[PDB]
Amino acid sequence: MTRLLVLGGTTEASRLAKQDADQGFEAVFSYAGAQPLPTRIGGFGGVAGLVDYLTREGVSHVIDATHPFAAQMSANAVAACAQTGVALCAFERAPWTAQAGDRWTHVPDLAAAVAALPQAPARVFLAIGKQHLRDFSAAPQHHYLLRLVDPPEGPLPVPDARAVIARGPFTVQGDTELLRSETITHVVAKNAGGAGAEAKLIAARSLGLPVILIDRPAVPARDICATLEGVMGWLADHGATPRGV
């Protein structure tokens, strides 16, 4: 009978994990690099790799609730599950939709984001965390602003840079103050994030400022579950059951 693997790295996953435990499913949870489920922390050694693991563990269903800018995992699951005949929903929160007063532009990747900043010097919230910040040195004439969950640990990759320290979950109040005091002119964001990720967008709207929005990476087709309720429905439809059935 049933045995689920949940690929995590998101709060949607964390929330899915509490359900599965609570309802008494047999499920393992998978970080790369606590949860209320047994937890596996490595990677799998590419595709198959995963196939080997899906086989030896006797996994019936996989839920890819990984981050949405973490595509190589998500696609590896697709292959491994396709080649293995193991079911697979993907629990992704639906990407953000613009609305009156937003002033958004869209770009494929980080590279395109850097290319879309203006010539004239600007003051630019890089709400990317995190990594590949290095890439914006390509436009050095801007005053950038960063939010890192850590201390810098070494200097700042970009010339005119001010960091700050990101506790979370962020809040419209906070993010608006932050942007206003820092006289931010543009925001750069990925189209992803749980928690109070959307606060910065709202604050940008409050102050009438543009966002450059990095669209999610391309990933092969797979059943998509946009909520928890759906995921659990999907699980029922595909014959999954808690302990005891």
Numbering used by the authors: 1 to 33, 40 to 251
Quote the study's own text.
In this paper we investigate the structure of the precorrin-6A reductase CobK involved in the aerobic pathway, there is a homologous enzyme CbiJ involved in the anaerobic pathway both enzymes catalyse the NADPH-dependent reduction of precorrin-6A5 to the dihydro derivative precorrin-6B6. We have determined the structure of apoenzyme, holoenzyme and a ternary complex with NADPH and product giving unprecedented insights into the structure and mechanism of CobK. CobK comprises two domains, a coenzyme binding domain and a substrate-binding domain, both of β/α architecture. CobK unusually comprises two parallel β-sheet domains arranged so the β-strands point towards the centre of the molecule where the NADPH and substrate bind.
The apoenzyme and holoenzyme structures at 3.17 Å and 1.63 Å respectively lack the β2/β3 loop which is disordered and the apoenzyme structure is less well defined overall than the binary and ternary complexes. The N- and C-terminal domains have a relatively small contact surface, there is only 304 Å2 of solvent accessible surface buried between the two domains in the apoenzyme and only two connections both comprising irregular polypeptide chain; therefore there is considerable opportunity for the domains to move with respect to one another. The presence of coenzyme, which buries 361 Å2, limits this movement and the presence of precorrin product provides further rigidity. The picture therefore is one of increasing rigidity of the structure as first NADPH and then precorrin binds. The CobK apoenzyme has few contacts between the coenzyme and substrate binding domains; the structure becomes increasingly rigid as first coenzyme binds and then product and this is reflected in the resolution to which the respective crystals diffracted.
